[PDB]
Design a binder for this molecule. Structure first.
Ligand SMILES: Nc1ncnc2c1ncn2[C@@H]1O[C@H](COP(=O)(O)OC(=O)[C@H]2CSC(c3nc4ccc(O)cc4s3)=N2)[C@@H](O)[C@H]1O
Length: 539
């Protein structure tokens, strides 16, 4: 019973007191006192914000927000591509106990309206690139009182820039050294409102508390579960800051004093040059970029000798792709994490000294996990596939103003049901099979796209893959694949089909065929768009 529940270990050291704003303040202040430390670096522009500058900006903005009239448990929003200024309003709000609602900068107007109607922010911090769409929607949304432009040094058309907002609402002689963030009940006060559709339904707002965040801050500094690079090391992330994957990794990087090199769009040459030129030792990727590291000839053109911590998350990573990356970079293994918006951050992480190729790691401190039978709901033992469920101190407070949806994902016993199929081995390493809804319904079988995608990615001419079921009169769904070929290489549909058939049981064959495409349709955290795949595989 409880014999089959898997528990994270003790944290290496106990949880630090204080709110997430108090812990961020202490960390920014520490690094600001060491000469030359840099917090944020824009790979496209080479512009930096130092830890000293970030401390100044976040404290001055917090004071400005208080004088503007914001109180604890008011809400602001941030709608912006990854840039140097994104986290200035995030951290300032956490200082004063104002909830932060990051909003996808690529949202349509209708998606924007639906997200903002949940969080109802009083102020929206936008970028030059999102200003127009935020202006459009604001006309319909009475609760928005103020727009602030993050990355302009001048006001635009009646809308104020960040620097002029701070100048208006704080005294120029404001003493940063004495500023103190607010103390409040970290178990109750919401820190972030993040967008997630969850296991079913329309997009919702996930409430994460300051307690959820400081538990993440415990993990990221933990000698076993944390990043294995020392303060001041350069780390390069390609993950959108408005998603939990990018939000709670990047916030943790500040507490570690890393130099965070960011991009607002991925470009292969700039990515590699940036790893080389900033002597990057750690990088945070999605599986498509792991395949790039494993297979691209471009990698050999750059000096990547400093890179030693290569991390993936967001979607299933093929065992063989991870092994190929580790081999090519002469590393003992790769780093991986698994989590959901609803669990704040990764709740399974590859621990220091403990790698198992194909496994996304072990349960983190302050968490427990179980695997439940899809039919009975009974708890399963090792090497038995079922739905992964989790309990621990980063589980969300719930969905904003949606207790019904909250109860559908967190059961009456307190377990969050992830919607993912997986298993754990005799040593506690967890393996993610696929999202339950992604399984292909071929007759009475359930075939996992990630299993077929992993085989496809074993082929030396295949650099990306996406598998789904296409509709079929007789069988319901036929497994079918979109394949991206390495430039200069050639494969026929028949070659790909036979390659897979030689390795899989009859039910898993690509009876729906293969299409060759220039890119797999995937989201910004690696989620494969199965509907987009079907549209290609029907045409
Ligand atoms: N490793 C994985 N293997 C297979 N499937 C995966 C994996 N990770 C996610 N999923 C799928 O993603 C679905 C949730 O999707 P979401 O709610 O949009 O949130 C998210 O993805 C974000 C929420 S924090 C998170 C992470 N923080 C870290 C920190 C370090 C690191 O080194 C890696 C990571 S990853 N992920 C979930 O249910 C699966 O189906």
């Amino acid at each position: 019973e409880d014999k089959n529940i898997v528990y994270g270990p003790e944290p290496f050291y106990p949880l630090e007191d204080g709110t997430a704003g108090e812990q961020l303040y202490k960390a920014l202040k520490k690094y600001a006192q060491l000469p030359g430390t840099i917090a944020l670096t824009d790979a496209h522009t080479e512009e930096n914000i130092s830890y000293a500058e970030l401390l100044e900006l976040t404290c001055r903005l917090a004071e400005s927000l208080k004088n503007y009239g914001l109180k604890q448990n008011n809400t602001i929003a941030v709608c912006s591509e990854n840039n140097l200024q994104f986290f200035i309003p995030v951290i300032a709000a956490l200082y004063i106990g104002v909830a932060v609602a990051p909003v996808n900068d690529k949202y349509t107007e209708r998606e924007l309206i639906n997200s903002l109607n949940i969080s109802k922010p009083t102020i929206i911090f936008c970028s030059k690139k999102t200003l127009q769409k935020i202006l459009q929607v604001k006309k319909k949304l009475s609760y928005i009182k103020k727009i602030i432009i993050l990355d302009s040094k001048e006001d635009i058309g009646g809308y104020q820039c960040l620097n002029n907002f701070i100048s208006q609402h704080s005294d120029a002689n404001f003493n940063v050294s004495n500023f103190k963030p607010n103390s409040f009940d970290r178990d109750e006060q919401v820190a972030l409102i993040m967008n997630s559709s969850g296991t079913t339904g329309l997009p919702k707002g996930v409430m994460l508390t300051h307690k959820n965040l400081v538990v993440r801050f415990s993990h990221c500094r933990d000698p076993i579960f944390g990043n294995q690079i020392i303060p001041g090391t350069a780390i390069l992330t390609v993950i959108p800051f408005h998603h939990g994957f990018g939000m709670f990794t990047t916030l943790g990087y500040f507490t570690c004093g890393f130099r965070i090199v960011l991009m607002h769009r991925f470009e292969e040459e700039l990515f590699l040059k940036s790893l080389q030129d900033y002597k990057v030792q750690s990088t945070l990727l999605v599986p498509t970029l792991m395949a790039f590291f494993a297979k691209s000839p471009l990698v050999d053109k750059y000096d990547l000798s400093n890179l030693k911590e290569i991390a993936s998350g967001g979607a299933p990573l093929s065992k063989e792709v991870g092994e190929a990356v580790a081999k090519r970079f002469k590393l003992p293994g790769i780093r991986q994490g698994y989590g959901l918006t609803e669990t704040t951050s990764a709740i399974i992480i590859t621990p220091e000294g403990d790698v198992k190729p194909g496994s996304t790691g072990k349960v983190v401190p302050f968490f427990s996990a179980k695997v439940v039978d899809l039919d009975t709901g009974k708890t399963l033992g090792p090497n038995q596939r079922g739905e992964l469920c989790f309990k621990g101190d980063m589980i969300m407070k719930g969905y904003v103003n949606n207790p019904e949806a909250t109860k559908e994902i967190i059961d009456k016993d307190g377990w969050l049901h992830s919607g993912d199929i997986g298993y754990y081995d005799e040593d506690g390493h967890f393996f993610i099979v696929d999202r339950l809804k992604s399984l292909i319904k071929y007759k009475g079988y359930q075939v996992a796209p990630a299993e077929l995608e992993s085989i496809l990615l074993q082929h030396p001419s295949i650099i990306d893959a996406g598998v789904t079921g296409i509709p079929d009169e007789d069988a319901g769904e036929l497994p079918a694949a979109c394949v991206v070929l390495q430039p200069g290489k050639h494969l026929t549909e028949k070659e790909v089909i036979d390659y897979v058939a030689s390795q899989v049981s009859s039910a898993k064959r690509l009876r729906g065929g293969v299409r060759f495409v220039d890119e797999i349709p995937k989201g910004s955290t690696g989620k494969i768009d199965r509907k987009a795949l079907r549209q290609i595989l029907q045409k």
